Amino acid sequence: SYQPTSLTVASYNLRNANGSDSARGDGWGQRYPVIAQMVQYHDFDIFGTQECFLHQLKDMKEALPGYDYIGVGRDDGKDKGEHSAIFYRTDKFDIVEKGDFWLSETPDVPSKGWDAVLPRICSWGHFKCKDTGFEFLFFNLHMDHIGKKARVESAFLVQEKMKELGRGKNLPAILTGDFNVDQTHQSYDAFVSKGVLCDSYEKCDYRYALNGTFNNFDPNSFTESRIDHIFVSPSFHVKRYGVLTDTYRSVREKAYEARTPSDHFPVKVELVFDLEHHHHHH
């Protein structure tokens, strides 16, 4: 028999480790243990991350017993630069296949695309659930902030890869990432306007959204802009969407102040997939 599958997924920009944040009291070394606690407490089965240098990935894996990650450095396709690394529970999934492509006219080589200013990488894995055998694609990326044409072109390249990487089969896909611009933009429409993918924010049964997704390390910020998304094939049923606003505290240089674990909030989505019946038709 074919059992339905439940998954908890997330997208979380962990913020690259740098000296400016550290000086402001938002240093990686102070933040990441809290990030790891959130992943554990909020039961992320598999999640896309953005902005991590390799040293940050190693820290996170050390802080996350039972997780591994996939995804290469965007600068040279090896250890250099920020990653779009995907973390997953090794006791829950096997990797059937994994890869990376750059968001450009030449996706196989580290390169800037169209009008973008930095190279940008999408990392992916074809996963298989150890319990139910359910197979799916999980993509993760971080879009360019300057190149509008690049963002739009990127959206369609990702959709082409979603088909290509099925290897002849119709594999359901989950796409996470930092998309840099909000839901009013053309590159957002590029994913959803034809119903190839659905925004979990829009399709969830239950929405818990006390904020948008960027906070700029400001624990008082508010916006309705969402720049971190989880898009899914319409064959998934989206049960619940949450933005996690959890904060820790630091001593004010006893007086304390709220600190955000990263300069984004994680987006957490709970999905169900019915192997027998998962088609939509109107």
Which residues are paired to 121 by β-bridges?
Answer: 102
Residue 259 corresponds to which amino acid? Answer: R
Query: Of the candidates 193, 153, 200, 147, which has an alpha carbon nearest to the alpha carbon of residue 173?
Result: 200
For residues 253 and 246, give the distance between their C-alpha atoms in angstroms, rounded to a whole number.
22
Q: Rule CB under 5 A: is residue 55 a binding residue for Br ion?
A: yes
Among 2, 18, 24, 41, binds its own copies (CB under 8 A): 41
- Residue 234 binding target from Br ion, its own copies, none, CB below 5 to 8 Å by type: Br ion
Answer yes or no whether residue 206 interacts with its own copies by CB under 8 A: yes
Does position 8 bind Br ion by CB under 5 A?
no
244: contact with its own copies by CB under 8 A: yes
* 32-40, 66-74, 76-84, 123-131 -> range binding its own copies (CB under 8 A): 32-40
| Stretch touching its own copies by CB under 8 A, among 3-11, 105-113, 173-181, 251-259 | 251-259
Helix (H, G, I), strand (E, B) or coil at 208: strand
Q: At what angle do helices 54-63 and 28-41 cross, to 10 degrees?
A: 50
Q: How far is CA 3 from CA 18, 53, 130, 131, 132, in A?
A: 45, 38, 12, 9, 6
Binding positions for Br ion, 123-152, rule CB under 5 A = 129, 148, 151
Q: Which of 194, 252, 254, 280 binds Br ion (CB under 5 A)?
A: 280
51 annotated as a binding-site residue: yes
39 binds its own copies (CB under 8 A): no
Give the DSSP letter string of 50-94: ESB-HHHHHHHHHHSTTEEEE--BTTTSSSSS-B--EEEETTTEE
Residue ranges in 233-272 that form contacts with Br ion under rule CB under 5 A: 234-235
Sequence-ordered alpha helix ranges (H) in 42-192 = 54-63, 148-164, 186-192
The CB-of-117 to its own copies minimum distance in angstroms stands at 30
Contacting residue, 1, 170, 184, 220, with its own copies by CB under 8 A: 220
CB of 13 to its own copies, least distance (A): 19
Contact partner, 211, from its own copies, Br ion, none, Cβ < 5-8 Å per class: its own copies
- H/E stretch holding 98 reads strand 93-102
Interface residue with its own copies, options 6, 22, 37, 235 (CB under 8 A) = 37
Q: Which residue, chain included where needed, has tokens 């006893």? A: 254
# residues contacting its own copies (CB under 8 A): 25
Using rule CB under 8 A, residue 30 touches its own copies: no
CA atoms in the 13 A half-sphere facing the CB of 175? 27
Tally of CB atoms within 10 A around 223? 13
40 binds its own copies (CB under 8 A): yes
Residue with Cβ nearer its own copies (47 or 53): 47
User: Kind and range of the H or E element at 203?
Assistant: helix 200-203
**Residue reference for tokens 């591994």:** 68
Binding site membership: which residues?
51
Residues that bind Br ion (CB under 5 A): 53-55, 64-66, 92, 129, 148, 151, 185-187, 214, 221, 223, 234-235, 279-280
Residues that bind its own copies (CB under 8 A): 34, 37, 40-41, 206, 208, 210-211, 219-222, 240, 242, 244-249, 252, 254, 256-258
